[PDB]
Amino acid sequence: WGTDVNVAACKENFQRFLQRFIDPEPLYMQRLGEINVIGEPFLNVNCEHIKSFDKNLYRQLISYPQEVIPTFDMAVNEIFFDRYPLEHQIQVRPFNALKTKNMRNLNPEDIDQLITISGMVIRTSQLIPEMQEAFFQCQVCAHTTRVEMDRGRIAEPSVCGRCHTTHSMALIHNRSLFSDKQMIKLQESPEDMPAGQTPHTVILFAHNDLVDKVQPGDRVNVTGIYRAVPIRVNPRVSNVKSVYKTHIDVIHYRKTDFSEKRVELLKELSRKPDIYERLASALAPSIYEHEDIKKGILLQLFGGTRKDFFRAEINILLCGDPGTSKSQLLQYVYNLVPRGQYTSGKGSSAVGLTAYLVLQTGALVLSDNGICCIDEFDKMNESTRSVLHEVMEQQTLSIAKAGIICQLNARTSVLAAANPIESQWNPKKTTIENIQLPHTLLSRFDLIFLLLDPQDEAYDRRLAHHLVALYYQSEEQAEEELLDMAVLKDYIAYAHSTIMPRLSEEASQALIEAYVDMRKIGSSRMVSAYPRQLESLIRLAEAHAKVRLSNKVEAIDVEEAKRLHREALKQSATDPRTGIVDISILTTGMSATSRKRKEELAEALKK
Amino acid sequence: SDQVPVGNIPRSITVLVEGENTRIAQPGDHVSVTGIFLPILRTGFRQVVQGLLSETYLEAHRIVKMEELRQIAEEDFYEKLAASIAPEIYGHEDVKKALLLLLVGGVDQSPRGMKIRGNINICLMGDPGVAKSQLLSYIDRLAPRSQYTTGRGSSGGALVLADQGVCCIDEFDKMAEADRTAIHEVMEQQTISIAKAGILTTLNA
Amino acid sequence: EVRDEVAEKCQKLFLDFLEEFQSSDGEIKYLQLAEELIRPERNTLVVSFVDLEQFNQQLSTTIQEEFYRVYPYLCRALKTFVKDRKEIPLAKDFYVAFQDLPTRHKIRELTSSRIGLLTRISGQVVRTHPVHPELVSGTFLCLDCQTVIRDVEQQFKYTQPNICRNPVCANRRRFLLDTNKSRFVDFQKVRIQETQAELPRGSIPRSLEVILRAEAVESAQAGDKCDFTGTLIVVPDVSKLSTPGARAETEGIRGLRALGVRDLSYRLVFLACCVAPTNPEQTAESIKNQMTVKEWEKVFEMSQDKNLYHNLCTSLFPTIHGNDEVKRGVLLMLFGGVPKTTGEGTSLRGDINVCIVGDPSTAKSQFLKHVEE
DNA sequence: GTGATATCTGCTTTGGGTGGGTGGGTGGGTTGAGGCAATA
DNA sequence: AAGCAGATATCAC
Ligand SMILES: Nc1ncnc2c1ncn2[C@@H]1O[C@H](COP(=O)(O)OP(=O)(O)OP(=O)(O)O)[C@@H](O)[C@H]1O
Ligand SMILES: Nc1ncnc2c1ncn2[C@@H]1O[C@H](COP(=O)(O)OP(=O)(O)OP(=O)(O)O)[C@@H](O)[C@H]1O
Ligand SMILES: Nc1ncnc2c1ncn2[C@@H]1O[C@H](COP(=O)(O)OP(=O)(O)OP(=O)(O)O)[C@@H](O)[C@H]1O
Ligand SMILES: [Mg+2]
Ligand SMILES: [Mg+2]
Ligand SMILES: [Mg+2]
Ligand SMILES: [Zn+2]
Ligand SMILES: [Zn+2]
């Protein structure tokens, strides 16, 4: 072999490295102790440490990884068995903290050398079995033999040892020994790409415990050996092309993006009198002065109680003029939730809402037990509207296509954003006629909010100052906001984990009286409420109880739910002509005054 | 294009590059290649089946890509530079000034080094024959990295090649919905998202 | 001939288990089930793994660790256990299924270390393929000496005898397949997918190929969520392999004689012996028979109740207040009329249609949902 | 003198349209123009 | 040109 590698000297040097190196008790001695405690036989070693201690050992590791790494394994095994008298022997995984190469600059001089590259995973293959030891059985005497694989070639026996028959040994594929392999496609990082060039892609091969350690979408630093392999002209001939193909044999992956103390902090927050407003403020610091919308979105994030007999999910629609902060709110909620999806109602959209050989479930099914953010709600076609109505009413999605008949669970909360059909919101027009959506679909939303653009000058000045301040915000404030967001996420996770509020007797009486009063308002003069709204109240009440980290729904929760529902209706249920109390616009899609006027017109034309 | 004979289609040649002549040429550059014109050797049974005809290639040997100044910068330089945009066009003084801003493009970073969008978007709406296409054609020739496209000349790519550049969209109201969605997302996120049967990918735009 | 000690011991112990294992009632549990295997359409016996674990833990462990190796011997033991009854032809083949495996694995846990072991998985069926006959043991005639060779095993590829049985004969290339004395099994290929519950967050679904055999064919439908019990195996690239009777048809391992200068790759498929749903000619007498005694007396009491119309109405729709007439109508729809056919071949409808016109939020959707559930 | 075992000989391959659309597209090949059903 | 199937003469023991 053309290598200046003496195995014994390398092993001794590496054992010396483990014994004496100190991180600026040897660090890797502590690592071996932790290995014994945990039981995972993998030792990661930073190549920078090896370089610092020994520049020859580092140089040999980089130049001849295939020869040198096994000697490192031998050294670590010997040392570890001395210090602590395990399913497998420990395996060293040298790695570089930072990439040493760009995917675009890989060269022939790097073949069979240890390199580190950064990238984003796009595809991973299913597991590929590799034969390590073949199993043969004589087709006459049943005598069995085992042959070790040698550089991808197997020495098939020619004569049975026991009975001496020739050409009688058949390979039993499923009695052999196999190991795992996986193909991964790594895409060049957007930052390192030259301007205007398409991303480059590289092939990686992972084996044994490194399979399935990355998923598509991951951003990773990969340390491995650069390989060059010949390509056959066709499968039948032994001719090869003079230009070789390349891949990387993965050696190390680095993914580059409750505690009792944490629970104590969360409970301490939950004890504070104004936890509701604190969480609401933390929800979206950038948006300005949309307090009730933020409170509703917080309650949607917490959700109501899963009774398991009843949708427990809270649906919110934000309709308003263009140039407001609707998309920003949807983005902030999408970032916050763990199982959320951000999508658009337009059909041309990259990510679809509908389920469509591989069965592909849409965003609504993917957001099951989560929140689906739908940005261009008004731009949905009729089929998408039917799908959304089915999801919101039944919490399931039925498919009968290509011989597949099934029902998919979709228990998802919809946060939707809507714009008017005109260039601006029309005060003369109601909500239904401002946004061209069926009233049947609108009646499935618990809360509808209106984000109108004021004509006030003082509002313009205040918003301008807000935006300028944000344009000049400092890094410490941004970090503080990030910490508050993390606290909010942990609080919501804990509440979902351990809190299941239930209705107390006083809450029940409060809800019944609330519904009766809402009905009375209309009954005094029309109808001012319908039973579905009562259900909404219950959900909201439960959500509020969950914010306090309380297992009992109290009267305060009911009062808050009533206030929020009454504010949303006052925002979105107002008839531009006369007043608000009329909810017939939601139930029938036509204003009561409009209905009377149309009746008059029809009667007159009938005259 | 200017060298193709009348009523013909441009031809192409294959260039094989080795060693230190690599990484010199990129798509889109104008190059002068010195090399050797050779036939492609077949192999195996394909030698026998194919006759006396051969494909060709060029074996690359050399690839070649193809205080007065302060005084010009010192005085009334904004007016002078704007007036120099398409001088053969008359009367669009303020539009020409706006197009110069689109070329410099505004500051890309916040005061703290955070990345912010500097690119400036302009739309020229007007009645026919007011030199809209002439102005767009001029900006394409001046811009170092740019792509000119028509509403129906291409659909379903030019944006990627125009990254860090200028994308001149002529006949902007003739495009389809799919093309409109792509333009909308570029003016929002400065990227293009594609989905190959569920395999997502994001490109810089 | 060399003898596989482990497999023979497993066969003997499995025969003992089939003969001796006792149910709660004191009868032999599987004798009465094997008694059903006299029918031509029945060839599979379903055995609970918990019963086997109770009977003999070492046997259960050996079966779990060497399932692929020992399964033919378990089938032979079943054949012996059925041999007594006269109605079975000597040519019939019998197969064993294993029902209740306590532990479950995920589709992404199917690694090389699981090859040949007994496993249980869950998945959603995406596609089903047509049923085929698959050769398991071929009978061949030797053209040189006219000797009949039987029980030639097949390994993923159409295989002919290696050497003629006759000691005097030296033939290695010329044989004739006789279909009528060969043994075939029903074969079906299905493609399944990860369930939405199992699919990791932000991950493309992983698909798997499952092979059903004998009775298991046509028992899973696309869109169903099913539990499969069986084993994970490797299937070689058949297209690369050349045999005396079968030429090769247009990296991996090298060096096999059947390979020439070619490479052999492998792919993982699941060989399922049992299929079940993940979440589980009629006449009045048969309906009664399907029921237990308690259920039958409950049905009779219901039939005798003099307030049955009202009790049924209230039981079906408990969440709805009022609207008794609507409940009565929906109940009558559920019971239905008598469909009839005329002498000339035309049909008289017997089904009942009902319509509910309602104001908003009046619980008509509640009626539809109650009926649907 | 029989059992390997080394040498020699003849077949057909390739994907391709002079090898067919009276083989078949579940055996496998971009680009455009042309009928459908559902669509708006 | 490249490679497998078949035929056949040839060394060795
Ligand atoms: N209330 C507000 N608080 C903070 N920023 C606001 C507010 N209203 C408008 N803005 C500013 O307006 C821009 C928000 O535009 P955004 O994309 O969120 O709008 P949108 O409501 O989704 O509307 P559309 O899609 O119709 O343009 C940002 O500059 C944001 O700073
Ligand atoms: N102000 C002008 N100065 C010089 N040439 C002009 C002027 N206005 C129009 N032209 C000439 O008129 C012809 C038409 O101009 P051009 O094609 O750019 O118009 P346009 O606005 O793009 O039209 P359309 O809307 O029909 O596509 C060109 O030759 C252009 O040179
Ligand atoms: N008579 C009733 N008894 C009990 N609950 C009722 C009654 N009427 C309405 N409800 C309540 O109203 C809700 C049922 O609304 P549902 O969706 O079924 O209405 P709908 O008739 O389909 O109307 P729409 O389609 O306009 O929404 C549930 O809360 C149900 O409890
Ligand atoms: Mg928006
Ligand atoms: Mg023009
Ligand atoms: Mg309804
Ligand atoms: Zn043998
Ligand atoms: Zn014979």
Q: Whose CA is nearest to atom 26 of ligand 2?
A: B128
User: Per the structure block, which two tokens stand in for C293?
Assistant: 């005694």
Residues 6+ apart with CB under 8 A from A33: A83, A84
Query: Which residue in A152, A215, A588 is closest to C253 by CB distance?
Result: A152
- Strand E nucleotides with an atom less than 7 Å from a protein beta carbon: 1-6
Q: Any residues with CB less than 8 A from the CB of C184 and at least 6 apart, and which?
A: C133, C134, C135, C136
Return the DSSP state at C22. Answer: B
DSSP codes, B154-171: ----HHHHTTTSEEEEES
Q: How far is Cα A574 from Cα A581, in angstroms, rounded to an integer?
A: 7
> Is domain C5-97 annotated with CATH 3.30.470.20?
no
**Whole-angstrom Cα distance, residue A268 to residue A262?**
10
Give the largest CA-CA distance in chain B.
74
DSSP A265-306: HHHHHHHSTTHHHHHHHHH-SSS-S-HHHHHHHHHHHH----
CA–CA separation, A508 vs A505, rounded Å? Answer: 5
* Separation between Cα atoms, residue A303 and residue A545, nearest integer Å: 10
Q: How many CA atoms lie within 13 A of A587 on its CB side?
A: 19
The upper half-sphere exposure of residue B28, i.e. CA atoms within 13 Å in the direction of its Cβ, equals 11
Torsion of CA B75, B79, B85, B87, to 10 degrees: -100
CA dist A530 and A515 (Å) reads 9
Instruction: Give me the residues of C, 150-179, that contact A with CB < 8 A.
Output: 155-156, 162-163, 172
CB A365 within 8 A of CB C196: yes
- CA–CA separation, C247 vs C149, rounded Å? 22
Burial of A306 (0-12, 13-18, 19+ CB in 10 A): middle
Exposure of A222 by Cβ count < 10 A (0-12 exposed, 13-18 middle, 19+ buried)?
buried
SS3 C191: strand
Indicate the SS3 state at residue A428: coil
Enter the tokens of residue A58: 């580092």
Q: Experimental method for this entry?
A: cryo-EM
DSSP B146: E
Buried b (16+ CB within 10 A) or exposed e, C318-356: eebeebeebbebbbeeeeeeeeeeeeeeeeeeeeeeeee
DSSP string, A66-84: HHHHHHHHHHHHHHHHHH-
Distance CA A194, CA A400 (A): 46
Whether residue A527 contacts residue A576, with contact meaning beta carbons closer than 8 Å, is answered with no
Whether residue C61 has its Cβ less than 6 Å from ligand 3? no
C346 near A CB under 8 A: no
Helix, strand, coil percent values for chain C (each to nearest 5) = 35, 25, 40
What are the residues whose beta carbons fall under 8 Å from the beta carbon of A376, sequence distance 6 or more?
A: A344, A345, A346, A349, A417, A419
Q: How many CB atoms lie within 10 A of CB A571?
A: 20
Q: How far apart are CA A238 and CA A255, in angstroms?
A: 40
Residues A438 and A586: their CA atoms lie apart, in Å, by 9
Burial-class residue C18 by CB neighbours within 10 Å (0-12, 13-18, 19+): buried
Compute, in degrees rounded to 10, the torsion defined by CA atoms A546, A548, A552, A554.
-110
- Of the candidates A204, A168, A160, the one whose C-alpha atom is nearest the C-alpha of residue A184 is A204
Comparing CA positions, the residue from A562, A548, A547, A550 lying closest to residue A511 is A562
> Is A326 annotated as contributing to ligand binding?
yes
For residues B82 and B142, the answer to whether their CB atoms sit within 8 Å is no
A130's CB contacts (< 8 A; 6+ apart) are A178, A179, A180, A181, A207, C112
Q: Cβ distance A302 to A492 under 8 Å?
A: yes
First to last CA, chain A: 108
Cα–ligand 3 centroid distance for C367 (angstroms):
9
**CA–CA separation, B175 and A423 (whole Å):** 21
DSSP alpha helix (H) spans, B2-116: 46-49, 68-74, 77-83, 93-104
DSSP string for residues in A202-258: EEEEEEGGGTTS--TT-EEEEEEEEEEE--BSSSSS--B-SSPEEEEEEEEEEE---
Q: Which two tokens stand for residue B138?
A: 């001029």
Q: Is the separation of the CB atoms in A205 and C203 below 8 Å?
A: no
**CB-CB under 8 Å, B162 with A122:** no
Q: How far is CA C278 from CA A556, A607, B75, B188, C124, in A?
A: 44, 67, 82, 46, 10
Beta bridge partners of A133: A148, A177
| Number of helical H runs and strand E runs in chain C | 10, 12
Ligand 3 nearest-atom number relative to CA A530:
12
- Cα separation of the two ends of chain B: 27
Please, are residues A232 and C260 in contact by the beta-carbon 8 Å criterion? no
**To 10 degrees, the CA torsion angle through C133, C139, C140, C141?**
-130
- 3-class SS of residue A488: helix
Distance from CA of C168 to the nearest CA of A (A): 14
Among chain B residues, CA nearest to A121: B201
| Cβ atoms within 10 Å of C153's Cβ, excluding its own | 11
Ligand 2, atom 14, lies closest to the CA of: B129
Local structure of residue C39 (DSSP, 8 states): S
The angle that helices A55-63 and A7-20 make with each other, rounded to 10 degrees, is 120
Backbone torsions φ then ψ of C156, nearest 5 degrees:
65, -5
CA–CA separation, B40 vs A381, rounded Å? 55
CA-wise closest residue to A321 among A394, A429, A241: A429
Question: 10 Å Cβ neighbour count for A5?
Answer: 15
Contact at 8 Å (CB) between A315 and A373? no
Q: Are A1 and A59 in contact (CB under 8 A)?
A: no
DSSP string, A299-358: HHHH-------------EEEEE-TTSSHHHHHHHHHHH-TT-EEE-SSTT-SS-SS----
Phi, psi (deg, nearest 5) at residue B106: 75, 165
Q: Give the SS3 label for residue C282.
A: coil
Identity at A269, one-letter amino acid code: L
The phi and psi torsions of C335 (rounded to 5 degrees) equal -75, -45
- Whether B43 sits inside 8 A of A193 (CB atoms) is no
User: What CA dihedral angle connects A307, A551, A293 and A568, to 10 degrees?
Assistant: 60
Alpha carbon distance C226, C277 (integer Å): 4
Cα torsion C357, C361, C365, C369: sign: negative
Q: Give me the resolution in angstroms, 1 decimal.
A: 2.6
Q: Identify the CA nearest to A590 among candidates A421, A430, A400.
A: A430
Tell me the pairing of strands C175-177 and A412-418: unpaired
Distance from C-alpha of C261 to C-alpha of C240, rounded to nearest angstrom: 10
Residue with tokens 């053309």: A2
**Beta partners for residue A220, in sequence order:** A119, A255
Chain C: residue nearest A405 by CA?
C223
Pairing of strands C225-236, C118-128: antiparallel
The Cα A406–Cα C123 span in angstroms is: 13
- Give the CB-side neighbour count of residue A226, counting CA atoms within 13 A: 20
Torsion, CA A574, CA A579, CA A583, CA A587, rounded to 10: -70
CB atoms within 10 A of CB A339: 14
Tell me the C-alpha distance between A325 and A449, whole Å. 13
Kindly determine whether residue A471 and residue B198, on different chains, have CB atoms separated by under 8 Å: no
Interface test with C, best of A153, A173, A310, A339 (most C CBs within 10 A): A173
Beta bridge partners of B62: B34
Contacts of B26 in chain A (CB under 8 A): 197
Distance CA B167, CA B119 (A): 11
**Alpha-carbon dihedral angle through residues C55, C58, C60, C62, given to the nearest 10 degrees:** -150
Q: What are phi and psi of C126, to 5 degrees?
A: -100, -40
The nt closest to C250 (CA vs C1′) is: D27
Bridge partners, residue A314, by sequence: none
- In angstroms, the CA A565 to CA A511 distance is 13
Single-letter residue type at B52: L
In DSSP terms, which residues pair with A170 in a beta bridge? A137
A457-to-A286, A291, A321, A426, A463 alpha-carbon distances in Å: 21, 20, 17, 20, 10
- The sign of the CA dihedral A342, A346, A348, A354 is positive
For B176, which DSSP code?
Answer: -
For residue B14, which phi and psi values (nearest 5 degrees)?
Answer: -100, 130
Q: Which residues contact C64 (CB under 8 A, 6 or more apart)?
A: C117, C118
Whether residue A434 contacts residue A319, with contact meaning beta carbons closer than 8 Å, is answered with yes
Alpha-carbon distance B132 to B126, whole Å? Answer: 8
Structure tokens at A582: 């009329």
- DSSP assignment letter at C86: T
| A532 CB within 6 A, ligand 3 | yes
Angle at A275 between CA A274 and CA A279, to 5 degrees: 125
Classify each residue of B84-115 as buried b or exposed e, where b means 16 or more C-beta atoms within 10 Å of its C-beta: ebbeeeeebeebbeebbeeeeeeeeeeeeeee
In this structure, what is the dihedral angle of CA atoms A56, A59, A60, A64, given to the nearest 10 degrees? Answer: 180
Please tell me chain B's helix, strand, coil percentages from 3-state DSSP, rounded to the nearest 5: 30, 20, 45
CA-wise closest residue to C94 among C185, C217, C212: C185
Chain A residues within an 8 Å CB radius of B44: 233, 237, 239
d(CA A301, CA B30): 57
| C1' (D35) to CA (A380) span, angstroms | 30
Cα A529 to Cα A519: distance, rounded to the nearest angstrom: 5
Beta carbons of C59 and C17 less than 8 angstroms apart:
yes
Name the CA dihedral angle for A336, A340, A345, A349, rounded to a multiple of 10 degrees.
100
- Alpha-carbon distance of A40 to A213, in angstroms, equals 15
Question: What sign results for the dihedral spanned by CA atoms A133, A137, A142, A145?
Answer: negative
What pairing do the DSSP bridges indicate for beta strands A128-138 and A114-124? Answer: unpaired
> Checking DSSP bridges between strand A144-148 and strand A128-138, what pairing results, if any?
antiparallel
Q: Ligand 2 pocket, B84 CB below 6 A?
A: no
Distances (CA, A) of A274 to A277, A486, A541, A547: 6, 19, 17, 11
Answer for A403: CB within 7 Å of strand D.
Answer: no
**Residues of chain C contacting A217 with CB distance shorter than 8 Å:** 202
Decide if B39 contacts B52 (C-beta within 8 A). Answer: no
Q: Which one-letter amino acid corresponds to residue C284?
A: A
Residue C118, strand partner residues: C231
Cβ C120 vs Cβ C50: under 8 Å: no
Place of tokens 């007994």: C118
- Between CA A37 and CA A40 the distance in angstroms is 9
Residues, beta carbon < 5 Å, ion ligand 6: C 365
**Which residues lie below 8 Å from residue A281, measured CB to CB, with a gap of 6+?**
A294
Closest Cα partner for C60 from C112, C102, C108, C106?
C102
Angle value at C-alpha C245, between C239 and C248, nearest 5 degrees: 20
